[PDB]
């Protein structure tokens, strides 16, 4: 997998060497094709994993993501052509390159055989992200948000560093292939009960768990649209990908060491879903929607039943695409409105007829409408959770009712009701804004036709 990567690196030379006026089209047009080369990995004609080479591999779980990581770079660069079009021609070429490095790094992290290669690349992605959030962040508080995003991930990260070096000494190689075909069975000691927490905690932090998710609402609030898309679509899912590949070892402990997180997540799912119900900042509501719909995932990567896992793989890819779509349209309202407040800007369909159709489809993806991969995902996690304990439906049942309420409230108070009297007149929709959306949903429609590709390792 060096075509999904080397051609990517070369994007950096192109963003720099290219003309200031033509820099945007060379980069966006080329990475669209970079995504097309990424699609070749999907050609798996047998169940064996495609080990491209010693360090680089792609199995069913990584492949559905590498393609998404390559896909969003085009979109990210199309959603940030407006803001970042007021810059000095060298601030742009920095932002474009920053976005380019994220998927170079993220493509490799999702396509990495050695778990510590994951760690080095895993924690590197913070550098590009923190720059995108802090350097271009509009609000006074991004310095703070950046600190929260760096420390919560970093304090979790050093325990994983110690744990992975620890298993290398215990087993003798951090190669995901071998670690899988070798006998690593923890022994339920008090210490192992700590190892397990060391490995999972760093992944559980960037996958916002109810206890440590305050970093994500603060980060996406002041982050520029491209950073918020990256955090929701690819960055948070880095934590999920890690939990799937790391729990191959630590096989016995999670049977009983998971209860704490599972309950934290399911109760967390309800409270995070509910506070979405009365949050005035739209970007705030989407972020907590992201916490709740990701709290379902940590509760399926821990129950560990075949269906959970691919419920997880289905939902992660699906929610990634949906969340960005929501964060992308939130930005289009923010740029014309100039405020994140949900109460202002009422009645837009009256003035932006189509964006409202995109808003409606994004919300229906947000809630579980049935001919969507989003629902298949939740339906499956719901099933397994029920298997874990029939009572789980109650808590995963209060979340579904709340999820319907906030998803439609975003449509009802932003895209319906009487028009706002006279905010700065709202200029019509650009074709870029609409495509950036179409590019998010057309793939959501196509993937829903053949869900098999994003089903995970389990199935």
């Amino acid at each position: 997998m060096l075509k999904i990567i080397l051609p990517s690196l070369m994007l950096l030379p192109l963003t720099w060497l290219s003309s200031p006026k033509k820099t945007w089209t060379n980069v966006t047009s080329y990475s669209f094709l970079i995504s097309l080369t990424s699609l070749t990995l999907l050609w798996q004609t047998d169940e064996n994993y495609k080990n491209f080479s010693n360090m680089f591999s792609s199995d069913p779980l990584s492949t559905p993501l590498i393609i998404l990581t390559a896909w969003l770079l085009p979109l990210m660069l199309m959603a940030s052509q407006n803001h970042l079009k007021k810059d000095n021609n060298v601030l742009q070429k920095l932002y474009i390159s920053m976005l380019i490095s994220l998927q170079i790094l993220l493509i490799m992290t999702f396509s990495a055989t050695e778990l510590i290669m994951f760690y080095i690349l895993f924690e590197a992605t913070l550098i590009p992200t923190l720059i995108i959030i802090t350097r271009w962040g509009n609000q006074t508080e991004r310095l703070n948000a950046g600190i929260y995003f760096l420390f919560y991930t970093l304090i979790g990260s050093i325990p994983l560093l110690i744990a992975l070096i620890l298993i290398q000494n215990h087993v003798g190689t951090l190669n995901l292939m071998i670690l899988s075909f070798t006998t690593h069975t923890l022994d339920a000691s008090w210490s192992n009960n700590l190892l397990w927490l060391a490995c999972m905690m760093a992944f559980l932090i960037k996958m916002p768990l109810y206890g440590v998710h305050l970093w994500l609402p603060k980060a996406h609030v002041e982050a520029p649209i491209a950073g918020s898309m990256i955090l929701a679509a690819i960055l948070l899912k880095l934590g999920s990908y890690g939990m799937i590949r790391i729990s191959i070892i630590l096989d016995p402990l999670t049977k009983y060491m998971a209860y704490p997180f599972i309950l934290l997540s399911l109760w967390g799912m309800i409270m995070t879903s509910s506070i979405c119900l009365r949050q005035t900042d739209l970007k705030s509501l989407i972020a907590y929607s992201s916490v709740s719909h990701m709290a379902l995932v940590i509760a399926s990567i821990m129950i560990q039943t075949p269906w959970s896992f691919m419920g997880a793989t289905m939902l992660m890819i699906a929610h990634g695409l949906t969340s960005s779509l929501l964060f992308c349209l939130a930005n289009s309202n923010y740029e014309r409105i100039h405020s994140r407040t949900m109460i202002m800007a009422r009645g837009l369909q009256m003035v932006f007829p189509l964006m409202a159709t995109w808003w409606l489809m994004a919300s229906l993806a947000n809630l579980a409408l049935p001919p969507s991969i989003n629902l298949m995902g939740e339906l499956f996690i719901t099933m397994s959770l029920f298997s874990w304990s029939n009572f789980t439906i109650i808590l995963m049942g209060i979340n579904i009712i709340i999820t319907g309420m906030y998803s439609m409230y975003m449509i009802i108070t932003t895209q319906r009701g009487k028009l706002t009297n006279h905010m700065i007149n709202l200029q019509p929709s650009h074709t870029r804004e609409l495509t950036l959306m179409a590019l998010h949903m057309i793939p959501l429609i196509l993937l829903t036709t053949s869900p098999k590709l994003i089903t995970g390792l389990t199935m």
């Binding site: 169940e47 096989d251 560990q304 039943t305 896992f309």
Partner: protein, 172 residues
């Protein structure tokens, strides 16, 4: 050649004759005549012309046959090479043993649409099988996590082979 009758048994068809008890015309008969003349003949003509074009240039495709490698039961410990070739041989049969169960899921479904109001009885050739096959799938692949591996089926079995040996010894 679309489906092998012996893998998807279809009970023979018995149809009551068309016995009319009224001089009133039976609309469907007339409609069906039309459907054939307007909807079938036209289509029928096209289809054939398809298959003849297909015949002019005909190709074949085979079904990879996988030689059987040594199973984990016999495979050195720590030898990642042998075990890798043997966890695949199982993960492969984890699927071949799963579409089999897909067929019994299906063969039955049909046998309860084809025998309504009698499903309680006529369709018990299958449901006896749906337990003869489910009691087995449950005994070789169920407790396992999402990290299903041949080593774990080897243990799921061998935890119970004690029981078919402790219980037996116990009965004494």
């Amino acid at each position: 050649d679309s489906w092998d009758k012996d893998v998807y048994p279809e009970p023979p068809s018995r149809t009551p004759a068309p016995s009319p008890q009224t001089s009133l015309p039976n609309p469907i008969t007339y409609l069906t005549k039309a459907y054939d003349l307007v909807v079938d003949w036209p289509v029928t003509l096209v289809r054939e012309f398809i298959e003849r074009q297909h015949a002019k240039n005909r190709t074949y495709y085979y079904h990879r046959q996988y030689r059987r490698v040594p199973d984990i039961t016999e495979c050195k410990e720590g030898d990642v090479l042998c075990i890798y070739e043997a966890e695949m041989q199982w993960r492969r049969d984890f699927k071949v043993d799963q579409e089999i169960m897909n067929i019994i899921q299906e063969r039955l479904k049909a046998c309860q649409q084809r025998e309504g109001e009698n499903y309680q009885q006529n369709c018990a050739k299958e449901l006896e099988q749906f337990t003869k096959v489910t009691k087995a799938y449950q005994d070789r692949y169920l407790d396992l996590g999402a990290y299903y591996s041949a080593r774990k089926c080897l243990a799921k079995q061998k935890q119970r082979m004690l029981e078919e040996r402790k219980a037996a010894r116990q009965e004494a």
